[PDB]
Structure formats: structure tokens, C-alpha cells
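Ticket closed. Logging final result for Phosphopentomutase.
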Amino acid sequence: NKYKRIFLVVMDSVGIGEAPDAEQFGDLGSDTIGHIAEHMNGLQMPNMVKLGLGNIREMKGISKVEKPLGYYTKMQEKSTGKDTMTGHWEIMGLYIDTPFQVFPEGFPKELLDELEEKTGRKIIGNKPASGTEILDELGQEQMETGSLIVYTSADSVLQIAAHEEVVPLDELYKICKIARELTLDEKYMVGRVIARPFVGEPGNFTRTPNRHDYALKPFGRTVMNELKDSDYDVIAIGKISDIYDGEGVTESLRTKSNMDGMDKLVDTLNMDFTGLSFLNLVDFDALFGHRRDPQGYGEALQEYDARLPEVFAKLKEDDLLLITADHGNDPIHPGTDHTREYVPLLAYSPSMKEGGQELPLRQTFADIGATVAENFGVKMPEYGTSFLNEL
Ligand SMILES: [Mn+2]
Ligand SMILES: [Mn+2]
Ligand SMILES: [Mn+2]
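Final structure:
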């Protein structure tokens, strides 16, 4: 193996400017890092700069350097959708024709009608909402009527809330499995069905730890599957395991924040493994992009950058570090949805003694999977062109 360990970091939703097909998605003008850099009056990201972020594209506070630490370029998304599953599935060697849907106006009547017909229960709510808002609004009616609170977020999810003392857990889970079958339909294609059980009384409702998720498996066997099948380590950090429904994962580390995510990356740097360490830093997307909060997003980016020098210090000669994103989510953009953007790509190993150079633009996110697969000598994915030999 050219590299004994590869650390792949997805900075979730950290896009680097509208893609060539951005207009199809109503994403003209979108620019995640660039708009944040403008809002911050110059983003402070000196370590990403040293890696060559500005060499990809110069933005306010983010300048090109003469001798970047590693190689740099950006990636274009080939799959139809701009959702998380699509992006991560593509990263790991797939092509996804059928996009996952989001529901800012609630779910179609046809879907809810069939869910009622199959469960024998009424559905109330049907809108984007946080767990707190929806329970305070409809938790009491739920208790009194035995109906299901169906809701969504800004992402591709269908959430079903029911009081544990009115609707038994096992019944909620069966109901969610029914919902999961019905949403395997391109008209209503949801990334994840989530059981949201809760307890308490009006004005004092709390969601319980008895949450269960029903995800779809990736539409094909991934590079992670092949690594795992060839006895390599695949260490998933944060929401990575969930995103792939555990496929190809040998170990999973749960995280609570971006800083916690970097702590777990550091933990894996301290592990004697051979294979892939795969982190998702989700806060950018969940807390800032979807909430159209450029200030929070800017701060989170700076907090993330400040953690990087410790990572640089722990990388060995036969380690490779990959930093990318899975789509854009421009916090100065209409609506609550993601943005169709190029993603940055930085590829760094301390073995790169004279620094890096520009890579050709990656025409699919699967170039990452392909590079990973070639490095470890496993079956190459159907999609993607490895840049391993360029490094
Ligand atoms: Mn848009
Ligand atoms: Mn994402
Ligand atoms: Mn999202």
C-alpha cells in the first residue's frame, strides 16, 4: 500500500461555488465559503490556506500560497441530487440517478392517505418543525386521539412522533417500517424514517432515547464494502455509519459536535489501523447552512481550522489526509434547502516533501472512492478516476 491509512474528512455542506448545472436546482449565485468569507469580512482559516484552499479559489481572507502543503482542486457532482446520501454515496464510488426528496410544504396527500389506510391511524401535523415545537403544538391531541404526528426537517426525513404511553414502542416501530416501505418510491423518496417517541404531559414533553432510524442502503456496493470485505479497517466517525446504513463499517464512533468530531479524528490517529478513517463534520449543515446563519457558519469554520495543526503533527509519512464536502448549503441563499455547488478537495501527506500541485478537476465525487480503492488494492468502483498516482 502506498498509504497505510487514509483520513477522509467531509466538511458537510462546505461548497465552493455554484456547479455548472446549478440553474436546474434554483441554485444560481450560490457560494457557501465565498458568501461566508464576505460576511465575516475575511475568513480566518490559515491552516486550510496552507493546504491550498485559496489555490482552488481565492476568497476574502483566503489567499493562494506559493507552496501548498498538499494537492488541491475541486469536484463536480455527477449524480442527479444534492442531498447527503447522494453526495456520500457518490464519494464512495456510486452514481445515483434518483434523488432524495425534501418536503418544505409537508408530504403529499397520496402518501399520507396510504399510511393511514395501512396503519388504521390518523395523521396530524405534516410540516417542517423541530421536535420541541411540534410536540408543544400537537402532543396533547396525539395523546387524546391516538393519531400520529408526522413531520419533517430541512433534510430528507419523515419523522413520526407518538407518546410511549398511548402508542406502544413496538407499534410505533412497525408503523415506521410501513412508512419506510411506502417511501421507497421516487415521488416520495425519503432518506430516513425516524421514530420519535416521547413522554410527559402537556407543556412538559420530552423525546425519549427510544428513537429508531430506518435508512435506505446505498444503491450499490461501495468502496467501504470492498475495504471491509478485504479485511481492512473502516472507522466511521459521526453520522458516516448512518449515511451508509452501516455498509462497509468495521467500527463506528459517535460524535456530539464538530469539536468532538475532531477529537475522534485525533483518536483514530492514535489507533494502529490499516484502511480508512471517515469523519463527517455535520454542524456546518445542521446548525448553520439550513438555518441561514452565515455568522455561526463562519465561526464554526474558524473553530474547525484551529484544530488542524494537531492533525498535521500526528500524520505519518504513510498517511493521507483528504478534505472535501458532500454538497453546498449557502447560508446567504433563499429557502432551507442545499445548494448545488462544487466541493473543495485537499489531499495532504507529510511524505509530499516539495508540497502539492493542482489536480485536474474531479468530474465525479467518485474519484475519491476510486483513489481509496486503488491505494488498498481492492476492486475499483464502476465510477470515478483515481488521482493516487498524481500524489
Ligand atoms: Mn437554491
Ligand atoms: Mn451533507
Ligand atoms: Mn442537510
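The longest strand covers residues 192-201. No further action required.
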